[PDB]
Amino acid sequence: DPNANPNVDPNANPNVDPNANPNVDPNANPNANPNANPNANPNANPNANPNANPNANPNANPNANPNANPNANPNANPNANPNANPNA
Amino acid sequence: QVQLVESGGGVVQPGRSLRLSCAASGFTFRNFGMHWVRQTPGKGLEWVAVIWHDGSNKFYADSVEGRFTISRDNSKNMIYLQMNSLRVEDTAIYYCARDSLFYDHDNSGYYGYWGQGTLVTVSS
Amino acid sequence: QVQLVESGGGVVQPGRSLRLSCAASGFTFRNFGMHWVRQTPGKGLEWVAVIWHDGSNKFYADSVEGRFTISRDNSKNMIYLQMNSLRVEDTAIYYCARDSLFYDHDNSGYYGYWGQGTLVTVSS
Amino acid sequence: QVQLVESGGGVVQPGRSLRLSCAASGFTFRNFGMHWVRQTPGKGLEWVAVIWHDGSNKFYADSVEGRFTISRDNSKNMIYLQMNSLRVEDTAIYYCARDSLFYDHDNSGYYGYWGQGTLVTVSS
Amino acid sequence: QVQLVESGGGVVQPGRSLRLSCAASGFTFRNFGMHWVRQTPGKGLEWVAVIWHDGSNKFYADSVEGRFTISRDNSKNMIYLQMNSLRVEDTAIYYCARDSLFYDHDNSGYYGYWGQGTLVTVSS
Amino acid sequence: QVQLVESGGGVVQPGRSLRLSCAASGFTFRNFGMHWVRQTPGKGLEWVAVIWHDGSNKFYADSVEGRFTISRDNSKNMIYLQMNSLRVEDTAIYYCARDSLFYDHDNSGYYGYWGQGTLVTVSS
Amino acid sequence: QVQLVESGGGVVQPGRSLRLSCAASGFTFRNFGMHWVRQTPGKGLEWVAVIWHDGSNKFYADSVEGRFTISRDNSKNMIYLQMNSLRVEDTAIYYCARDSLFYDHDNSGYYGYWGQGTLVTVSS
Amino acid sequence: QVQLVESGGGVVQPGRSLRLSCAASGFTFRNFGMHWVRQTPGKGLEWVAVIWHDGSNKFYADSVEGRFTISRDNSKNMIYLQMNSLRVEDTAIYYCARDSLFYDHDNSGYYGYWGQGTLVTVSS
Amino acid sequence: QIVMTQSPATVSVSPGERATLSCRASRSVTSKLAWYQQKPGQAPRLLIYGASTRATGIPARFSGSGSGTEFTLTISSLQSEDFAVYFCQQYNNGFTFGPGTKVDFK
Amino acid sequence: QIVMTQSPATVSVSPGERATLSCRASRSVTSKLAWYQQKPGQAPRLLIYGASTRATGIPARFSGSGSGTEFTLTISSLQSEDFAVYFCQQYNNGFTFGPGTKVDFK
Amino acid sequence: QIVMTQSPATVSVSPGERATLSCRASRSVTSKLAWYQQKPGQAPRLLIYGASTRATGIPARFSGSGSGTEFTLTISSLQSEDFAVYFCQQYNNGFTFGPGTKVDFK
Amino acid sequence: QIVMTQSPATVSVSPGERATLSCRASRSVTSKLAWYQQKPGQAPRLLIYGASTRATGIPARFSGSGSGTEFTLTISSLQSEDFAVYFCQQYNNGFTFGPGTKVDFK
Amino acid sequence: QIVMTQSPATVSVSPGERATLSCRASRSVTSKLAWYQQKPGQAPRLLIYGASTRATGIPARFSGSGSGTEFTLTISSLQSEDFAVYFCQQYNNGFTFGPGTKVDFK
Amino acid sequence: QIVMTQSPATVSVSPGERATLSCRASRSVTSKLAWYQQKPGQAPRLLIYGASTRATGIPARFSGSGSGTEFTLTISSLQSEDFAVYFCQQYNNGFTFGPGTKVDFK
Amino acid sequence: QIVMTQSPATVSVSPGERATLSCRASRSVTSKLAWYQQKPGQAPRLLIYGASTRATGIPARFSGSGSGTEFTLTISSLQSEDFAVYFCQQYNNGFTFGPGTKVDFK
Amino acid sequence: QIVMTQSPATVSVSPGERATLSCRASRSVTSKLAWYQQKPGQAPRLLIYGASTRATGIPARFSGSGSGTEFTLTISSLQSEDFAVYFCQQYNNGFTFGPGTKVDFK
Amino acid sequence: QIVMTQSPATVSVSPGERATLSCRASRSVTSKLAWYQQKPGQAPRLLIYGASTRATGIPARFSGSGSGTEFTLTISSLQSEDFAVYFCQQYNNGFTFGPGTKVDFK
User: Fold this and answer.
1) What's the structural domain count of chain G?
2) D57–A19 CB contact, under 8 Å
3) CB of B32 less than 8 A from some CB of A
4) Are the C-beta atoms of residues I1 and B104 closer than 8 Å to each other?
5) Distance of CA I41 to the CA centre of its chain
6) Which residues contact B81 (CB under 8 A, 6 or more apart)?
7) K95/L9 Cα distance (integer angstroms)
8) Which of A84, C51, F67, P33 is 20 to 30 A from L91 via CA?
9) 3-class DSSP state of E28
């Protein structure tokens, strides 16, 4: 009907309808969304987080690492240390 | 101060497509439906199309059925009318006018606020 | 104890802007829609605007169409009415009112609770 | 085996605060919405509150609007009902009820599974 | 070449538990959600469970709600289905089915690729 | 000055593997997600794959799902595309395209900047 | 028996420097982070600074940023707070508080063990 | 007393490189991220670049992408901005700005504390 | 929209008497109409909503009736605190109030 | 919201007979209505949901029917265990219960 | 939830002729309905998804149509390999299958 | 996903006039639709992104418009280097391209 | 950061009577909230941490609960030594305390 | 990203009067919008941050409010030192500034 | 940290039958969970580490599985020496054990 | 620790053709993966170290790549001397080798 | 190890202006990078060590900066006696030099 009212009815119910289904929908798409933004977010928080745990972590690996470099380090200081103890 | 400004006018050849844009300000745009009105010298005012508040239902006139497309963008407060396959009978002044001064459920379809209009000429 | 308190009133010159605030407590604010009601002595009570529960839809009276802006924030339980381009017709006491005492799907639009009202006068 | 167990009942004085807890097991807790149902002898059963699956929306009855707060924690599978400013009219048995036997989009709002209920009485 | 191979079937007694496994290859496993479909002769096909791409949400059928637990491991491309407290009604063929042929936002919930099936029988 | 150059092109037999590499310069490489876009004459432009800024998520087209593999190294500013199990349908020019002109949260997925393209021919 | 003994308190003039020392015993000092907490009558408890287990990271409140310097020395089981540019707003009792009762990865930031406290008065 | 002072200003020809430096004092430098803000007469304030607290992440504006490079030295309390391939459009006053007044996880990206700024002019 | 008029403008009734208040709409409002009580210096209060239903806490002394374009409000036994001005609202089409009818001591 | 009423309050039927319980709503609730059975000392149990659908585990003895404003619950041949108080709930608009109809010995 | 029915139970057609299978839903599922083909000893194979869209690798022989509660699957010219049992699924509300229609030799 | 069609396949305009290219999607893509221009032997160039926003460096001659399922690409007064193929992409759901439209000398 | 408010400021309770305390947060805090007890002349003592977990050595008399922006501390049978001022802390975003609520003799 | 505009370009207010500065964003910025004050030859000063919160040292004279796409900054009783140019920044999506509004003597 | 629970406390299986043990964690543990077998008078023996990896010397009879908060240990066909008490440990956050489940003759 | 796998076991490539070998890791090894070449009767020879860097004296023919869990080795134009068995090693976590892929005549 | 690259290879300038010299390393060098100046005929001279520290006797005209992978050498007002070739060294991992860049008359 071309003569139907096109304006919105302000007399519609403005309150939230409690009879809406409170159960979560199983028909929601379970696949990952490729249309999500792949760019890094510049609006993230650049400040440090004091809420991070300040306590030492006991779950760190206590075993000696075999993947440490076994070759000698040429970048060590070749100069004789003047701060070595000069006493007897 | 309901201000409606029409644009997109000019002269185009028959068989081509032109686009008209209508910017609306001074009222809640998304709560009302807008129209398009055609004024032809020697004929008078002629209705073109109507759009709903969100564009759900669109109704066109017989003289422009199947050729003209109406659309709206509530995020920009603009009304569009895409006139494809224009003919020599389409030369007239096109008016962007809002439906009714205020909301009344039993009274809708009359035009409260009109725009200055734009001229579209179809000729060779 | 549904308590509605208004603020932001005072004296302003015509053509300027005033902002009213309305703090609501004692009920789940985000589940209900709120109104603004205007009382002009010599005219009676006049409706101004209504906002949806989440602010999705906003409606305004014809006398304030395009000049008044209603807004809400559910994290602070407060209601805003932005009044721009005030005119000497706008002097009145403005009431913050909640819609309905409870939820009845077929019955909504009556003001179950009202605030004490803030007085806004525009003059030179 | 949908097993619902209420707890935290007892006797309090008017104007004080009481809290009821409901431990739910035997189903995926975070997939369904829960209710609280109150049974007053001589009046029958009356509805109190409802909470969404993820705790987004909360709806309360008129008689308990603004005084009772419903909440949930999907990690320990519990439903809580905080009762502030209790009155003599709030003496009854409170039941922890689950909405629907299974998911159906067009059919929700009935209590498919009830808890045994807990007694809450207020007096001096 | 989407290949799904189930395992972990066999014979069980009522009231015991069986764990089915599903090996997936030929596609990006972590980008899709997986289903379980059960075929009982004389009853037909019936859905059992579904899991999200990252395993955030898990949905079960009415007849298996609270007894069956679905899991996934994106680092090994494996889909699991823990079946605790089995009954004679659970004797059927269990298929590992991937959701959708390709990602479509408005079209999901059909089984694009099925596995060959595994037999689980519950009898003494 | 953003320049994208591809390499690794050539001619291979069906069923064999080819590795395309794309070099990126003129921007912060690790802040943007890169695409591979395919152009086959007679078919038009076609999308192949996408990788997140740090390579957490990778999405492939249906026609290439399970055979192609996209990766990146933010320390060398290069984008790779492993084309395993090639077929005659994969004969086309492969472009290295960057997503978006700049960061906009609600507007991403369009290819602002393209490379010159490399030719991959599958035949005997 | 976690025992914390503050020291270094007294009376100083505004704009001068005072150094507080906190002695800890009864636990492995180097495994935990330590806090400083400020109590002013009429305002309540106030957080000041936190130091990591190895002293790598230090964080301060807004009101003490750039003026108070927290430090630790694991070889003496001591916690220090250097207070430069003291103002009249800094008078309070300062508590040495250890973070957490035991190591919990997802729960840290509460003060399991408080010191006896020391009084710092700033005036003329 | 957080004081931010910058240097490295002057006059350079187009196509040449300029390096700005910014010294920070009065706060823990390594716990906050710093921005560069551009002000041009006739255009207003403009954002340029941001760096993280440890310099892990760097984000630049579209107009400066690939030409400017932000860096920081937490050991010397200095902020640097390398400006290669300068163009005439880059004539402006560059401010050293710190992000946020204090740590608020849900509120960051505003410049609470600014520096006096240096003038960089590109011309022949 | 809908024009609301109330007649008579003022009514004079002694305490303990019955008072009749009339509300008339220009067009049909079906059964969506509320009544409000406002005292000097006070905000309006909801007495009757719908067409006859009474708000919580309102005594049964207040009774409203009518439908369509003719609505009436009756105070069965007017007390001392019931002397005020009464407004009529329709919310079926828009939100319009009435001019108001005052209850005065006789 | 919606007031729910039942009639008659009590029904006396000997075991083996047929008992019919009626539920009536002030306004239409379409086909959203549940029937609950409560035995003394026990929580209510859902018998029928929707307008006719039976909860899992309910014998075919219980039969619900009706829509709109006239509902009924029929027990074709009651055993001894079918003697209790039955509540009528509507969840089309709000969540309201009926006063309760009791079935006892004849 | 939504119950799914297929009719007739068994369709007899000789190779070369057009065979039509029907599927009906208790409530409207719009245009979210998938068809599957199962041969003895084999897992079901997706033929049609949506309402008419055809899966990759499926010949243009299979043609589906319909929306709402009435759905049909049409085999334009049934070959020798098209003899199997076909299942009807709706994924608009839950995931429910039909009983299945078997196509056999004439 | 969404199939994009462009009409007409080729449009013939001499330099100086107005050229319009139309793009239509099967399902609504809101306002996520980018236009690309590809010259012979060159990679495509982004002209318009979103629905109307113009890429940096693009002259104001190229004007984009439309939303939903009907989009147009308008060239105000075509020069000589604007003769190329124009592609239509939607990135609301997946990533699909149009067949391309040729503009050629009249 | 987070503004922490406690209400009421002071509660009047007698020994053996159950006393409750309320804590409110401006924004979401989830389940990171600790309760401290400070006696006159003494340092605060950790009673509850997380949202309900009890510190070692704290009698089961003290019961905490709540999440998000509503946290409560409940003393089941308040004894003579339980008279002090109780503080509410959040450690989700920063480290902010509440003003403190004092329990006193009735 | 988000285009920010301010209105009016300039305001003329005598000392002691109330001056209102408005700000508008092209798209929704939720509640992430700050206001800066710049005096000639001086670096901008952060007055209000987020939507309304006031930086330390800012007098209660400055009052910020608004959310979504409509923001206003209100100066209740503007003093002599409050004559400057005020900038509106959003940091919800990117980091963009408004053109700036100048407050001038009347 | 994490409280670790096992159910049931005792399982009875005849030799040759399959015995399954369950382990539940209060919070997420991911894939860091070990199973230990202790015989009377002997030290515990590591069977499974990680979530499923089997220690050297342990026969393929023992098969661990599960992730997150649900972990199961399955003995495919238990012999006579597999009668003992099985402890469940998590090392994701701290080092906590389970109470222990005993396997006994039937 | 980390289990190395290679596929296919044998590849048949004629001289002058391009040969590709694959190496896949159970968990990410970043970019620490070396390739070795062993001819019968001879010790393995280091061709590639890191992820792509070539050992000194290795012809530019041998081109490897990959990072994370997917690694490949490509021989651009295999000569007669390039017929051997190639081993994949990771040294990110421990020192584990692959089974080895043999290249033979076609 | 770490490969250093200098850009541009040669720079053209007249005495009195500012000259910029860039050094880039493949991997991070922290702050251990030295600059050397070699004129034709004699050994290079150490100008800058560390990242910015100047050797004793070097005029303040020579300015160095940068850390990590980007390094620059800037001369405030380039003079005549100092036209030479400049080398970039890293001594954090091994000892490598850059290819060297030259400053020349314009």
Assistant:
1) 1
2) no
3) yes
4) yes
5) 19
6) B19, B20, B22, B36, B48, B49, B68, B69, B70, B71, B94
7) 43
8) F67
9) coil
Please give the distance of CA J86 from its chain centroid, rounded to a whole number: 5
For an interface test with L, which of A31, A33, A35, A37 has the most L Cβ atoms less than 10 Å from its Cβ? A35
Separation of alpha carbons Q93 and Q25, rounded Å:
11
Which residue bears the tokens 């980091």?
A: N95
Strand E58-60, strand E68-73: pairing: unpaired
Kindly list the distances between the CA atom of residue G104 and the CA atoms of A52, A61, G37, M50, in Å, as whole numbers in the listed order: 12, 17, 21, 11
Question: Which residues of chain C lie closer than 8 angstroms to B2, CB-CB?
Answer: 66
Residue of E nearest to O13 (CA): E16
Judged by 3 or more CB pairs under 8 A, whether G touches O is yes
Tell me which chains share at least 3 CB pairs under 8 Å with chain O: A, E, G
- Nearest 5°: the CA angle I49, I51, I57 is 35
Resolution in A: 3.2
Tell me the technique behind this structure.
cryo-EM
State the SS3 of chain Q: CCCEEEECCEEEECCCCCEEEEEEECCCCCCCEEEEEECCCCCCEEEEECCCEECCCCCCCEEEEEECCEEEEEECCCCCCCCCEEEEEECCCCCEECCCEEEEEC
d(CA D18, CA D10) in angstroms, rounded, equals: 8
Range(s) of the domain holding residue N74: 4-105
Residue B118 lies in domain? 3-122
- Count the helix, strand and coil residues of chain M and give each as a percent rounded to the nearest 5: 0, 50, 50
Q: How many CB atoms lie within 10 A of CB L75?
A: 21
Does residue D105 sit at the E interface (CB-CB below 8 Å)?
no
Compute CA F105 distance to the chain's CA centroid, rounded to the nearest angstrom. 22
Burial status of residue M88 (CB atoms within 10 A of its CB: 0-12, 13-18, 19 or more): buried
- Other C-beta atoms closer than 10 Å to the C-beta of B80 total 21
Q: Distance from E50 to chain K by nearest Cα, in Å?
A: 10
Nearest CA-CA distance, residue Q66 and chain A, Å: 21
Distance CA Q89, CA C35 (A): 73
Question: Taking CB atoms and an 8 Å limit, are M1 and H102 in contact across chains?
Answer: yes
Measured in angstroms, the CA of O63 and the nearest CA of chain E are apart by 11
Residues 21..40 of A with a Cβ closer than 8 Å to D: which? 21-27
Substitution target in E80, E83, E85, E86 with the highest count of O β-carbons within 10 Å is E80
| Assigned token pair, P67 | 């990072």
| Cα angle value A72/A78/A80 (rounded, 5°) | 130
Q: Do strands N96-97 and O4-7 pair parallel, antiparallel, or not at all (unpaired)?
A: unpaired
Could F109 and L43 be called an inter-chain contact, meaning their C-beta atoms sit closer than 8 Å?
no
Q: Which residues of D touch M22 (CB under 8 A)?
A: 17
D57 contact C CB<8A: yes
Radius of gyration of chain E, Cα coordinates, nearest whole angstrom = 14
Distance between B103 CA and the closest CA of chain I, angstroms = 8
Q: Identify how many contiguous H helices and E strands chain J contains and give both numbers.
A: 0, 11
Cβ(Q71)–Cβ(Q51) below 8 Å: yes
**Number of domains composing chain L:** 1
Angstrom distances, CA of residue Q82 to CA of O80, Q8, Q78? 90, 18, 8
CATH number at residue P85: 2.60.40.10
The SS3 call for residue A57 is: coil
Return the SS3 of D74: coil
Contact residues, chain F, for N27 at CB < 8 Å: 106
Domain harbouring B47, CATH code: 2.60.40.10
Q: How far is H106 from chain Q (nearest CA, A)?
A: 31
Q: Which of D77, D72, D97, D96 is nearest to D27 (CA)?
A: D77
* Residue L67, C-beta contacts closer than 8 angstroms, at least 6 positions apart: B71, B73, L30, L31, L51
Q: Which residues of A touch B33 (CB under 8 A)?
A: 6-7
